Ligand SMILES: N[C@@H](CCC(=O)N[C@@H](CS[C@H](CC(=O)O)C(=O)O)C(=O)NCC(=O)O)C(=O)O
């Protein structure tokens with residue numbers, strides 16, 4: 001049953017792009033949740049000098065707890081459980097398109113720049129991790145720019161936000177982090193600007209999260 | 221009215237394409253097989269900064285319009301929505317989320333690490349690193365997947381019928397074997413793989429049955 005007293009708890013790190021996607025689905029659906037910070041920096045530093053993954057959406061209903069993992073799985077659950085406002089359109093072609101744009105990020109871009117990948121690159125070849133990240137992010141953004149520019153609306157798919165924007169916006173933030181020039185992706189930059197003006201996008205941004213450090217205490 | 225026709229751009233040994241071959245076979249859907257010369261393609265990509273594209277692509281024509289569906293997971297979701305029976309997702313919200321997470325552990329969490337471009341770039345910087353990396357990341361993904369699958373598996377990854385989860389698992393185990401990984405540490409994955417292998421659709425989708433497989 002779609003029991004209505006579910007409470008939600010998100011395990012999140014302020015600048016995790018994977019967690020940010022889920023923050024965006026939650027914000028866009030107008031869903032309240034408890035923020036449970038997971039300090040991935042502390043865990044990295046502790047593990048170095050010698051498991052907890054993000055996102056996890058914990059759903060509690062009357063003494064039963066469900067732990068939902070994988071951003072895409074979590075977002076598809078949100079869309080089934082709370083269908084309005086829809087972040088997938090009702091037509092099947094559009095659904096496939098939106099899922100493909102999400103997957104270009106989910107599977108095609110982010111994994112190549114995740115923190116474990118980058119750490120293992122730069123252990124073998126100092127400095128190369130950031131060059132690698134820029135290469136693979138640029139490749140993913142080029143695929144997106146082409147696939148989006150196709151009959152583009154104001155957003156990645158039509159004239160309202162969808163799951164595709166939930167994946168695009170955090171990925172462009174990571175692109176900027178690594179110093180990738182975004183000049184070649186004008187459609188993506190336009191979409192990013194349209195999203196940035198919306199209250200739910202503002203709410204989900206890293207800088208607004210409970211665990212966000214001030215600017216002068218952030219690593220690159 | 222032009223009724224729906226399916227054409228799959230595939231390469232016999234591509235795990236991403238195989239996933240979609242499994243969805244199509246499980247649903248009893250005929251399709252035209254369109255072979256892609258992936259090895260020639262990847263040689264070009266490597267020499268040209270991979271600017272040029274991926275399989276699978278499912279080309280669908282209906283009512284005079286053509287749709288090119290990309291990304292295995294998006295294609296498989298479309299097949300499940302467009303042709304519901306037999307179902308490759310469970311009916312209940314919690315089981316759907318579990319099956320999608322299992323699928324994504326492979327789709328986003330294991331296969332990208334071992335993508336031919338990723339391994340070529342490693343191999344260009346440090347010869348042999350590609351093998352070490354693939355083995356590390358596939359084993360890591362499979363270890364996590366074993367734990368997750370064991371909590372909910374029946375005969376198959378989720379309960380007692382095949383689901384999208386098994387469409388991701390089976391090709392990924394075949395790739396693990398290509399990289400020489402011991403599969404002993406994943407007994408649940410192996411038992412599920414064996415249950416799937418016995419089924420006609422899995423047999424039909426396997427690399428060795430495809431038109432582009434070597435003699
Ligand atoms: N495909 C998964 C990706 C999850 C993921 O990469 N999570 C990272 C957070 S995203 C972040 C990079 C980012 O901002 O994209 C990273 O740490 O890699 C993580 O939890 N790392 C800690 C760990 O595994 O122990 C998903 O979509 O949920």
Ligand SMILES: N[C@@H](CCC(=O)N[C@@H](CS[C@H](CC(=O)O)C(=O)O)C(=O)NCC(=O)O)C(=O)O
Nearest residue numbers: 107233234235236273274275276291292335336
């Ligand atoms: N997340 C995507 C993955 C697609 C993918 O990696 N496709 C590979 C084929 S899968 C294969 C590796 C495999 O067997 O997994 C590989 O050759 O990299 C491909 O077409 N590469 C050529 C290119 O990018 O130009 C999807 O699920 O469709």
